[PDB]
């Protein structure tokens, strides 16, 4: 009877039960291929295989493999029968209609859920923070968005999408690590660099001063030892890597950085709501985890915004999972129970019901 919440990320699936403080299942969004099984899903592939990611930049693009991920989610991870549980799924901001329709059809016709709902990821993180109005910077493995939201509605004309996120930052770290003469080439080595990123990287409050500091001394150098004993030592790469979020030209992307796109997004909204966006800047997703990133955004947004604006960055320690937590809260609400698309409603209206019920 308990509702299920599933946040399908480009990199990680977060799944569990509404009411819980956290997703009980977190596993890679991959299908791997080598009377053995023909494919290995999630942690199966993790534990000889070529990996495919069914979700790209937050959008489902391999439906056959996505079906495998959901099967793995229900039956192997959560160990539930989906026919017995209302299921809340997440989607990226600006997810195309055809996609949301197909998610809906597969849930009702393939998994036979009794009810379902699709929510925008960024809206859920805002809800997790106890707000229905605000602007969210949601940055994960595959995509980054600025999403201004009023009374629970993402305001689509003002949404900014940026195809720079966690995976690109890992790849960039690998690239600049070659300057010190290191070489990381395999899937397992990319994972090692992902870990270096998650452990040693940070966002400098003043990038140019930090570069000067790093040039002067060894004060910022850190070592990282692989389990095999090989050591890699890292200096200014620590902060140059996530600097890319603020200066996308670092990877050759001629696009505004995340501070500028926050400003642009707000400036596209109704004059009256702007003050409320500035005062309610919520960060969510794994790529917002860098030490210093909240401080840096506070400074940059403050530099762009009028003096009249109180600027507040909300960055809870659990923010890697804010989307899921917001889903867990939403699906457990009394007021939300009339919002589910029911099987009966799908039967009568077809997959396009998702446009009328999920917003």
């Amino acid at each position: 009877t308990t509702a299920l919440v599933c946040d399908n990320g480009s990199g990680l699936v977060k799944a569990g039960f509404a009411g819980d403080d956290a997703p009980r299942a977190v596993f890679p969004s991959i299908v791997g291929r080598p009377g053995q099984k023909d494919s290995y899903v999630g942690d199966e592939a993790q534990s000889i295989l070529t990996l495919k990611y069914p979700i790209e930049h937050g959008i489902i693009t391999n439906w056959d493999d996505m079906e495998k991920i959901w099967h793995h989610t229900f039956y192997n991870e959560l160990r539930v029968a989906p026919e017995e549980h209302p299921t809340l799924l997440t989607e990226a901001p600006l997810n195309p209609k055809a996609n949301r329709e197909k998610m809906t059809q597969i849930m009702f016709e393939t998994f036979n859920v009794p009810a379902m709902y699709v929510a925008i990821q960024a809206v859920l993180s805002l809800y997790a923070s106890g707000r229905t109005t605000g602007i969210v910077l949601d940055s994960g493995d595959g995509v980054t968005h600025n999403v201004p939201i009023y009374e629970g509605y993402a305001l689509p004309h003002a949404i900014m999408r940026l195809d720079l996120a966690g995976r690109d930052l890992t790849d960039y770290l690998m690239k600049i690590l070659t300057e010190r003469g290191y070489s990381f080439v395999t899937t397992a080595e990319r994972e090692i660099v992902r870990d270096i990123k998650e452990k040693l990287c940070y966002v400098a409050l003043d990038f140019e001063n930090e570069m000067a500091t790093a040039a002067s001394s060894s004060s910022l150098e850190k070592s990282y030892e692989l389990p095999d004993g090989q050591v890699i030592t890292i200096g200014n790469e620590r902060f140059r890597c996530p600097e890319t979020l603020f200066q996308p030209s670092f990877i050759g992307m001629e696009s505004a950085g995340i501070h500028e796109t926050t400003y642009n997004s707000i400036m596209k909204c109704d004059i009256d709501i702007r003050k409320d966006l500035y005062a309610n800047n919520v960060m969510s997703g794994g790529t917002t985890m860098y030490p210093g990133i909240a401080d840096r955004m506070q400074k940059e947004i403050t530099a762009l915004a009028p003096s009249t604006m109180k600027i507040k960055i909300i960055a809870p320690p659990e923010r890697k999972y804010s989307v899921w937590i917001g889903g867990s809260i939403l699906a457990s609400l009394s007021t939300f129970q009339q919002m589910w698309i029911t099987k009966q409603e799908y039967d009568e209206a077809g997959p396009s019901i998702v446009h009328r019920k999920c917003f």
Binding site: G130, Y150, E151, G152, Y153, L155, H157, L330, T335
Partner: peptide, 26 residues
């Protein structure tokens, strides 16, 4: 999450917000 539930249940309708020019969909 009482404060949240309150805010959600009294949200203005999509049609009204589109009519107010707040909500501009793609």
């Amino acid at each position: 999450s009482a404060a949240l539930e309150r805010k959600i249940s009294m949200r203005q309708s999509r049609e009204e917000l589109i009519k107010r020019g707040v909500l501009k969909e793609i």
